[PDB]
């Protein structure tokens, strides 16, 4: 009944200014507008979205409308909404129900407001976290027959879709864009490579060069963190449980050992594992004075922060999201973002260009499911490679790249189409 | 009937000396010898092997005999045999039929001498290229019922296996070792990173720093080549047809453009594409005087060497595998290895440690098929991830890497066994 | 008469907290405190200091008092004082006259309050810019006979000292600390390497990877800037007027060309030249939409900001020290810090460890002049190499570096003392 | 009386071919020919040269003749002569007295043949090692008044000229080009960076990635070696006696410790110190099995090879300049080039482009002394910066560099000439 609900609609001009700046760093989304604003391949679609209502997501929203869709939006987190961004979407005449600092009750309400449109119920789900997908299946299963497809971009959401399918709960075809090369590499590797040191610097202003930096995990996040630190002249040590990832680290010349050993040597500690119990009290007790300890991996479970609160003799807040503990041995630990994500707590998260790749993935998913009614049966499907390739291609102009086109003869010799896809499904890049 | 056939068995003390050195660089294979010589898991096995008869292969061969197997061998290429390696294998009482400079008839003959042992015929195939596999199926199909498994490590061989399977010709279970992470990364990326510049240096002794180097392709070979050239202070320009691979290069700060533009800029040219018509007369006509041109990708189809032979006013052999042409415009081009593989023509191919990973994959496949017949249907199977991990784990000691073991608690949290596998099959590393 | 003058002495607990953190990053100064607090080598000294009243400078100040000196201080710039640092110095009973947002009259006043102590006038000068040195010589020349030495750390100040000496105006021996290896490398190369991208990120939050970055100049600041940008995966193009510096860039694989050509290519522009007319309207007219332009070299003379103010159709303040202009061609330029120093306008300047090297040079100079009057004629003297080495040696413990000591035999072979100096004065490192 | 003496004058065509190839990698020398072949600034000069009679030095010789000088040449080492190069110079009508494998008696004779020309005695000395300079002063002091100048390019020769001057022996003005930036950087840093791994690879074919490489010394040679090894994925450890050099290493993220510690960890050992007793028996006894030990620094005094010969239980030659010792502990050491220079023993020395910078330095010295009769008094002088700059500038075209020219206004503001020099004499680059 409310046409939108935002904090302050007067912030819309400030939102529009930020939008004007972000658009230039989001060419993937802007290419989609250039290519599809006349043909309007999403005409008919009624997309309910649930995703961090940021400046970046606003560019995504307005891309979808430009492609012909009706769109109604909520946030997937209670603090990630940027109110000026939300105001700008509201003022543009797009139903948005989101503000910074929602209650759990207000959060659910917001999502519920996106389900019904002027002409009828939603017919497409765009989700980050599975909350919109879970709400429809548990609370509003009447609407499932009318929904053509789900796009999902997070690890949690994809893991959740696989369980729903395993248990017979899932009733709508779903495209997983989380495991696209263009999504995964920007969200995990390039993103964290840019923002790790940004967070550490804003938090501490510390010299990186000449320090030992211990990075737990050498997956895509660890790889980027390690590369970043190394570029500044830090000596990086890696820890790993996977022998293949450990081997990769060794072949780049990184020392690889255990946290038990490395806790005695590190000036800076970065956890990127996705796993519990990486840095623990017995590690803290061995650390050099004023060791910087932060997490860029799993939400808040990698570092035993509760140990520091329970065993330290002093806790002094330095600035927002920077606390300095003194231990019984008389040495200090500088803990960043309360053991949560350093890139969100002490910096501005992912750069716009990163979000461009992730959201251009989701625009592709939406078109693919909506444009091909009967193509995808109920289940979780990977985004086809040709669309993953089209995401990358959409950014090349901005990257100052001239891509080569295969000649017909060359394509014949390779046994592939000159428009792609160019690699088999098992190709690792 | 003849117990072996080599060029000169007087080279066995030389071969043995080279073997001893190689063993220390092949910890994967030596770790297999340590772990499995008491249990003799390949006891009973009569393995026919068709694989370049090198020092490295000779270590693989003696690893298979340490594991209990009887083995008989030939090279999979007419020039690839190292005679001293073959002589050392011969003196050790291993029947080996291989020498440098075989004829095509002699090549076939050599493979045919490996099919029948003392106690009877072969029961296992270890292959590189599919020749030994194609010989059995077309010319000795009576031996097929008694053969338990094939292991194949080459792209050529695996494509050939899939076609045999699609057309009902394949009669034996086959493990594909080519697409293992440990095999593919070493054979493609790290191997070429180690040896590209070795070849160029041996051929030319040229300064690399301060040159423009044009690398066609940014797959695993291109990535390795590009990284190597960049380490020496060359400015690397990349050409690509895949949007994803092109973007990957852009994100490491490489210029990405077309060969049409780059041919006027490059001092050095390296083709890594696996494709036809990469460097053409069109391009040669524009190159700087004394541009160095070489191929490390596909055998011989990437550079149009035929054009040079037909259109140049001079062709001068500088040294073996180094030809300097003078064109009608008066400018000179230095072609390496006749447009064939520079790392083989102008250097010593892959370092032993690279082959340790590829051949340790092989031993895993041979154990896996001889030990568990029950397990694999007639068809082409990827090596299981746990064995791929084990290949990597076997090399970590040599690298002085201390791997972390997950606690029971951590493994339960991650929903994985603390012995692995640690990644899903779609994980790209 | 007034015992100190600060903005708000209630900020002393905040200052003290910041000092404690900084001390651990300034091992050079803390090593001086450990080595010299028993012998009090600056006992008797009444040092007037004119140097940015920061947390780092506050550590220097308390180091000088630990060494026995009486000291009185003012900032060498009207905005550079950190009030909390000044308040902490004030509460500690050090007479300090400095605050953020002084007037020019107040600036002079503040320096004039440092000339006369309790027991009498100053006898030593520690200076940054030459202002305290110029004030004494023109306005208090009666105090010159009682002053034993000057230490000066700034290019501006040293040029000024040489002119004073050439024209017979200088009446006190002066050590030049600006051209020490430990000072110059940290203040110019490593400092700017640490903070360039900190400034750009804080200002813009922009992705660096995959951009063309144009760095004008390849001296020590350009080298550092270039290395940093390159580490993030930006493609760095360099402009130079010196053939040697240009060649150095070429040999690391940087493209070297003119601003006239590069202005059409760059996404980011960093001037490091110390020279006028580097970026002009001529260049702005050619730039890509939303090109980021910033200066980290000379104060404000490198970019023609005046042209932008006079010829743009829009100037919008995005945030403090970030202005986005729209030109008559419709394209936008993002100017950082009003063409002034990006690392100061948009970040926190040099990390503490950098200033530790510069200020540990200062302490060495002050000890050297107060302890050995006999030694230095009226004139400008480079810091002796052995003291430059000692500055570096003092920082090695923090870096967990184990230095090798020459044996007596090795030192005799090399014709040097095993305590140094280890290099001739022309050695460039 | 003999017009030349070479090994075989029939090798001249092969020499000329190598010369044609080298000229394209020696633009500095070729630029000198382009600029000066008409004006002929060395007309009148009668230059006796003493320098490794290589293909590269042949380009230098023919550059000097092109500039108007009469030239007669000998080698400065008894094995460095490349006979085909010597043949080509002989056939061109230039008196050359040099062959590979001279006796000490033959060596002296060769130098003596260069002293007298058709029209009179030599009037200029071009020297590498000081042997020609020492011969004239001790044995032929009658000729000293007729000699306008000496150019010298080696550390030994420059150290020798300073002692001669200190003792009153030196009677001719001398230009030291050894300490030019362009000479020193190419001879010490860029040169060894290119050739170290070339030597190790040709000697061993070993994998570099994943190994610990211990580099003793972090001067210009160590810096280049370390950078090279790091680029291949080795983990580099540094040892150092100088705290400034140690600090530099630490700021690039290299572990810095002692050989006593590092001998237990290293897979590869490289000595670059210029000093005795770097690697010793007690280090060898701790080394991992098949550790590779080589020297690229001082001739043959850094490694205690005599210890290996006296204490090892086996010594096996692998190939030329590669010996593998077995110790009493049962482990093996692979020693390269008998502890002499690995880049000369196991590779082809410096690339041509390196020699171009060194020899273009000497052409500048010769012109400078000959063209300015009364400018330089007797003594050792550094080559002026403007000529060092001109050397760099001569190579920029080949490096694909477009150098910027200062505007008159810019030059005024900087207080320098728009033609240079651009830096003060103490500038370190
Ligand atoms: N901060 C962010 O904005 C951000 C962005 C993307 C992803 N992430 C998160 O980062 C985490 C890792 O992401 P990824 O893509 O690198 O995952 P990944 O699976 O590629 O990498 C995780 C690595 O950690 C290793 N590991 C697991 N337990 C370990 C232990 N106890 N000690 C050492 N190593 C251990 C695993 O072997 C694995 O290789 C995930 O939790 C993901 O949600 C955070
Ligand atoms: N030299 C050796 O010993 C050696 C070792 C391993 C592999 N190889 C060979 O190297 C080749 C490449 O192997 P890979 O693993 O890098 O394969 P890949 O598929 O990972 O890389 C090939 C890349 O070339 C690109 N490409 C194709 N045609 C192109 C064109 N016309 N212009 C520009 N780019 C083009 C593709 O996009 C692809 O990214 C194969 O032929 C393989 O057999 C050689
Ligand atoms: N941001 C800071 O806090 C900070 C710190 C230290 C130094 N600086 C300043 O940075 C500037 C440079 O310092 P540096 O140590 O690198 O000096 P430098 O002399 O080592 O480097 C300056 C380089 O700029 C080049 N150059 C001059 N005019 C040029 C032109 N028109 N085009 C292209 N290149 C040109 C010169 O050839 C020189 O190599 C100085 O003004 C210095 O005061 C700033
Ligand atoms: N192989 C070649 O072709 C080649 C080329 C150029 C120079 N060189 C030689 O290389 C050597 C070094 O040249 P450079 O220009 O690097 O000299 P440098 O003085 O710049 O470097 C030598 C470094 O070794 C350090 N050192 C001295 N004794 C040490 C010890 N016992 N342990 C550890 N470090 C120690 C010194 O502190 C110094 O920094 C010289 O002997 C030079 O003649 C060889
Ligand atoms: C500190 O400033 C910010 C700025 C933006 C968002 C946030 N808040 C979160 C909270 C949580 C729990 N997760 C995320 C992820 C990881 C980074 N992402 C984005 O940056 C992003 N996603 O959509 N637009 C974007 N921009 C999504 C971001 C905080
Ligand atoms: C230059 O001297 C040598 C040395 C070794 C082998 C060769 N010959 C070939 C020929 C062909 C056609 N293909 C190969 C591939 C590519 C790299 N490989 C190995 O290096 C390798 N494979 O088994 N042991 C190994 N070592 C296999 C090698 C030539
Ligand atoms: C952004 O907040 C800050 C923080 C610190 C200082 C400033 N202000 C200036 C102003 C001017 C004109 N010059 C400088 C130089 C360059 C770098 N320096 C230091 O960082 C530094 N010097 O003493 N302690 C230090 N810290 C000295 C710094 C501003
Ligand atoms: C193995 O092949 C070669 C090739 C060339 C020369 C040598 N021999 C020596 C011997 C000694 C004692 N010193 C040197 C120095 C260091 C390297 N230098 C040159 O390369 C070089 N100098 O003049 N033209 C050149 N080319 C000079 C070279 C060996």
């Amino acid at each position: 009944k409310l046409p939108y609900k935002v904090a302050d609609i007067g912030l819309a001009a400030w939102g529009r200014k930020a939008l004007d700046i972000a658009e230039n760093e989001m060419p993937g989304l802007m290419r989609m507008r250039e290519r599809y604003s006349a043909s309007k391949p999403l005409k008919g679609a009624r997309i309910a979205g649930c995703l961090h209502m940021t400046v970046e997501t606003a560019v995504l929203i307005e891309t979808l409308v430009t492609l012909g869709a009706e769109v109604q939006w909520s946030s997937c987190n209670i603090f990630s909404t940027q109110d000026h961004a939300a105001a700008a979407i509201a003022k543009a005449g797009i139903p948005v129900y989101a503000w910074k600092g929602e209650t759990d009750e207000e959060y659910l309400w917001c999502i519920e407001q996106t389900l019904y449109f002027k002409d009828g119920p939603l017919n497409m789900i765009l989700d980050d976290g599975g909350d919109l997908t879970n709400l429809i299946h548990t609370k509003y299963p009447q609407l499932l027959p009318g929904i053509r497809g789900i796009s999902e971009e997070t690890t949690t959401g994809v893991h959740n879709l696989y369980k729903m399918m395993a248990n017979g709960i899932l009733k709508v075809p779903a495209i997983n864009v989380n495991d696209s090369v263009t999504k995964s590499k920007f969200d995990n590797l390039y993103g964290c490579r840019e923002s790790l040191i940004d967070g550490i610097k804003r938090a501490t202003d510390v010299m990186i060069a000449g320090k030992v930096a211990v990075v737990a995990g050498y997956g895509d996040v660890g790889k980027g963190c390690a590369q970043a630190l190394r570029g500044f002249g830090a000596r990086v040590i890696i820890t790993e449980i996977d022998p293949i990832n450990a081997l990769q680290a060794a072949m780049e010349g990184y020392e690889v050992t255990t946290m038990d050993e490395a806790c005695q040597e590190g000036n800076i500690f970065v956890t990127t594992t996705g796993c519990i119990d990486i840095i623990l009290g017995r590690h803290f007790e061995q650390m050099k004075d004023d060791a910087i300890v932060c997490n860029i991996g799993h939400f808040d479970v990698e570092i035993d922060v509760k140990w520091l609160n329970e065993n330290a003799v002093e806790k002094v807040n330095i600035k927002p999201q920077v606390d300095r503990y003194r231990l019984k041995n008389g040495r200090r630990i500088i803990l960043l973002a309360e053991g949560r994500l350093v890139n969100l707590g002490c910096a501005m998260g992912h750069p716009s260009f990163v979000m461009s790749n992730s959201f251009t993935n989701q625009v592709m998913a939406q078109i693919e499911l909506w444009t091909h009614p009967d193509k995808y049966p109920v289940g979780v499907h990977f985004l086809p490679k040709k669309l993953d390739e089209a995401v990358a291609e959409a950014h090349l102009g901005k990257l100052n790249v001239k891509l080569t086109k295969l000649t017909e003869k060359q394509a014949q010799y390779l046994g592939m189409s000159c428009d792609g896809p160019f690699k088999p499904d098992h190709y690792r890049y």
Side-chain angles (χ1 to χ4, degrees), chain A:
Chain A
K1 190 168 172 187
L2 276 161
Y4 58 87
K5 193 177 185 195
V6 304
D8 183 2
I9 317 131
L11 302 169
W14 180 26
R16 183 53 55 188
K17 166 199 274 185
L19 275 169
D20 190 84
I21 290 167
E23 283 168 23
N24 273 349
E25 288 293 306
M26 303 185 88
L29 296 177
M30 301 306 286
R31 276 279 193 92
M32 294 312 265
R33 296 186 188 180
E34 290 172 346
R35 290 212 272 265
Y36 291 125
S37 63
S39 68
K40 300 210 177 288
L42 300 172
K43 67 202 155 189
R46 292 194 301 267
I47 303 172
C50 186
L51 212 182
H52 314 285
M53 186 55 255
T54 59
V55 169
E56 285 82 1
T57 299
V59 178
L60 165 60
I61 291 159
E62 294 199 316
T63 299
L64 294 165
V65 170
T66 296
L67 272 44
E70 303 298 296
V71 181
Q72 302 187 144
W73 214 268
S74 53
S75 206
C76 70
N77 180 276
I78 55 169
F79 299 111
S80 62
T81 298
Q82 296 167 346
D83 294 318
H84 72 302
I89 294 295
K91 179 154 175 165
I94 297 156
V96 59
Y97 308 88
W99 58 96
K100 186 167 169 71
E102 304 171 3
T103 70
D104 288 348
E105 215 181 7
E106 290 169 345
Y107 177 75
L108 174 60
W109 181 88
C110 285
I111 301 166
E112 288 175 333
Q113 305 324 296
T114 66
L115 306 183
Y116 292 106
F117 295 65
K118 172 165 144 280
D119 289 313
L122 78 168
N123 62 27
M124 286 298 292
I125 295 163
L126 198 159
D127 213 350
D128 177 299
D131 277 3
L132 185 46
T133 304
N134 279 331
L135 188 56
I136 273 71
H137 286 91
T138 62
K139 191 167 183 175
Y140 300 83
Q142 306 94 340
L143 311 185
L144 289 161
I147 299 162
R148 197 167 290 182
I150 293 154
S151 61
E152 176 55 68
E153 72 182 355
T154 67
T155 303
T156 308
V158 171
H159 284 322
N160 184 57
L161 287 165
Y162 283 127
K163 289 174 198 146
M164 289 168 70
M165 186 61 182
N167 298 321
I169 283 84
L170 193 265
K171 304 298 175 203
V172 178
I175 285 175
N176 156 23
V177 301
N178 186 47
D179 296 305
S180 295
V181 179
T182 52
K183 197 276 174 172
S184 64
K185 290 285 186 274
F186 280 92
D187 190 42
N188 303 338
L189 172 73
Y190 303 130
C192 297
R193 185 172 77 186
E194 298 267 331
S195 73
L196 170 65
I197 293 172
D198 204 11
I200 293 168
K201 285 284 192 177
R202 293 187 212 214
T204 65
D205 302 291
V206 79
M207 194 86 168
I208 302 296
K211 287 193 166 55
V212 178
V214 177
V215 176
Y218 198 74
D220 278 4
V221 177
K223 278 173 175 77
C225 292
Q227 190 175 3
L229 288 159
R230 181 164 202 170
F232 275 100
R235 179 150 61 78
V236 178
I237 301 179
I238 303 300
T239 85
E240 253 295 352
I241 63 101
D242 194 321
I244 297 166
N245 294 71
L247 185 50
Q248 285 181 305
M251 298 303 294
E252 300 306 307
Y254 294 111
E255 186 175 358
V256 185
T257 190
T258 58
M259 189 60 72
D260 291 345
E261 302 263 72
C263 67
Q264 301 168 62
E265 253 65 12
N267 300 105
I268 297 171
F269 290 86
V270 191
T271 60
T272 79
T273 68
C275 181
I276 52 166
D277 303 328
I278 307 308
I279 303 178
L280 295 175
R282 68 199 175 76
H283 300 126
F284 284 127
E285 288 168 351
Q286 302 301 309
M287 285 179 185
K288 290 172 162 167
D289 190 32
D290 270 336
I292 292 160
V293 183
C294 68
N295 172 45
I296 194 162
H298 188 287
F299 196 55
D300 83 316
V301 84
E302 311 217 12
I303 305 167
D304 196 344
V305 172
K306 191 159 74 65
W307 188 91
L308 287 170
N309 289 333
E310 289 183 351
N311 293 275
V313 299
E314 307 184 7
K315 176 180 179 177
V316 179
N317 183 244
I318 305 309
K319 69 181 74 170
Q321 304 298 323
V322 183
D323 296 295
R324 184 167 191 239
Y325 295 82
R326 188 183 177 88
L327 308 184
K328 284 163 190 159
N329 68 15
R331 294 189 292 214
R332 275 71 57 83
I333 306 293
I334 298 173
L335 194 273
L336 306 194
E338 300 175 273
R340 303 199 200 77
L341 303 179
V342 71
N343 65 322
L344 307 190
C346 306
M348 301 305 298
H350 284 326
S352 299
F353 193 79
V354 166
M355 305 318 305
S356 182
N357 284 275
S358 296
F359 298 164
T360 307
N361 261 273
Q362 251 162 353
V363 170
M364 296 283 185
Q366 289 294 308
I367 288 162
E368 182 64 18
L369 293 165
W370 185 251
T371 300
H372 303 95
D374 293 304
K375 181 171 178 195
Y376 293 92
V378 171
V380 190
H381 310 271
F382 293 112
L383 182 75
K385 191 161 291 296
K386 196 168 176 185
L387 300 179
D388 193 8
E389 286 171 0
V391 174
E393 187 275 325
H395 296 79
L396 294 180
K398 176 68 187 211
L399 291 160
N400 318 286
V401 168
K402 283 154 114 156
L403 191 68
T404 302
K405 198 73 175 181
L406 289 175
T407 64
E408 182 153 290
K409 189 190 173 195
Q410 282 175 323
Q412 273 179 225
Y413 176 84
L414 292 172
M416 52 181 71
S417 167
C418 71
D419 296 332
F422 302 111
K423 305 289 193 290
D425 285 336
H426 67 271
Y427 190 79
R428 296 195 177 92
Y429 305 85

